[PDB]
Design a protein around this ligand. Structure first.
Ligand SMILES: O=C(O)CNC(=O)C(=O)O
Ligand SMILES: [Mg+2]
Ligand code: NI
Ligand SMILES: [Zn+2]
Length: 331
């Protein structure tokens, strides 16, 4: 069995290997990359996402989100308070302001220590989940707006034609902006490209050990767990690496820098934070190996999770027994 310790693997494809996206995902899995839940892919030196980032300031962040924490430094939830619209140029200036800027630090490890010590005492503002793309239309390799769609994959594997669409999302971050512990919708893969700016630190639990994280979360968030049998679908809970280690939960960590891709694998729980002003692009995708994870994905039916239109068909076809309850939680 390849990668039996479930280490995060880093790949350096050549320009020739960068042509066929599906083939390269299958290659990484042949080497055991999925066992970690997360892999890094460093593009060949010949590749670029677009020519420059000099002309992005007029993108609108319609609903910036202030991420307010509750709890203790290593075990907390966050809620998202909506703020007034602002442009990317306005948001960048805000991120660089004395109130929000990255503090002085020695290295990524010192910054990680400061994040976990101090995150709860501040409320950073995140431009998340903005439909759009920063890949040039002429970028033919690993262009996250030109991937094969999940509806086409389901149709190819299972023969059923379904409605829905699959488009990318932009994320504008600042110091301490935080992504809570989650797997993807329907336990899909994700791919994330860090277009510019400061790094993103990731934490990940191997898919084969995801239920260990779920059991700890039920212990640590006991009211939330009574409210919903899949409350991590709400994407609000944080647990630090120190708490994970104290409770014996297997995990790994890695820092993504600008110009790098990350892939999350089906049922790979992940969480993390941004180091300073940055912009990432991400999208969900599927492969044939995903189908069995999709069929077994947990679902929130309490009303909190609310998701896109396009997830309807996935539940309806893959999980018909669960469909009626889940759809009620969507309405
Ligand atoms: O970058 C973020 O805030 C969160 N991204 C992801 O969870 C992802 O790409 O799967
Ligand atoms: Mg612009
Ligand atoms: Ni994710
Ligand atoms: Zn729920």
């Amino acid at each position: 069995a390849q990668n039996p310790n479930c280490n995060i693997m880093i790949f350096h494809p050549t320009k020739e290997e960068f042509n066929d996206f599906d083939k390269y995902i299958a290659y990484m899995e042949s080497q055991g990359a999925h066992r970690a839940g997360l892999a890094k892919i460093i593009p060949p030196k010949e590749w670029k996402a677009r020519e420059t980032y000099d002309n992005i300031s007029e993108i609108l962040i319609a609903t910036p989100l202030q991420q307010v924490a509750s709890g203790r430094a290593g075990v907390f939830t966050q809620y998202h308070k909506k703020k007034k619209a602002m442009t990317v140029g306005e948001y960048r200036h805000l991120a660089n302001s004395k109130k929000y800027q990255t503090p002085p630090h020695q290295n990524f490890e010192d910054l990680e220590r400061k994040y976990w010590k101090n995150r709860i005492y501040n409320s950073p503002i995140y431009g998340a989940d903005i439909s759009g793309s920063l890949f040039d239309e002429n970028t033919k390799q690993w262009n996250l707006g030109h991937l094969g769609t999940i509806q086409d994959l389901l149709e190819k594997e299972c023969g059923v034609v379904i409605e829905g669409v699959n488009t990318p999302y932009l994320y504008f971050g600042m110091w301490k902006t935080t992504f809570a512990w989650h797997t993807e919708d329907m336990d899909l893969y994700s791919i994330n490209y860090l277009h510019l700016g400061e790094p993103k630190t990731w934490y990940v639990v191997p898919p084969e050990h995801g239920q260990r994280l779920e059991r700890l979360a039920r212990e640590l968030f006991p009211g939330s767990s009574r409210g919903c049998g899949a409350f991590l679908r709400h994407k609000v809970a944080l647990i630090s690496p120190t708490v994970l280690k104290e409770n014996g939960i297997p995990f790994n960590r890695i820092t993504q820098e600008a110009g790098e891709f990350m892939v999350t694998f089906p049922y790979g729980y992940h969480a993390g934070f941004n180091h300073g002003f940055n912009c990432a692009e991400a999208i969900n995708f599927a492969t044939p190996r995903w189908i069995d994870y999709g069929k077994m994905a947990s679902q929130c039916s309490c009303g909190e999770a609310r998701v896109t239109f396009s997830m309807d068909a996935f539940v309806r076809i893959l999980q018909p027994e669960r469909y009626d309850l889940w759809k009620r939680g969507q309405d």
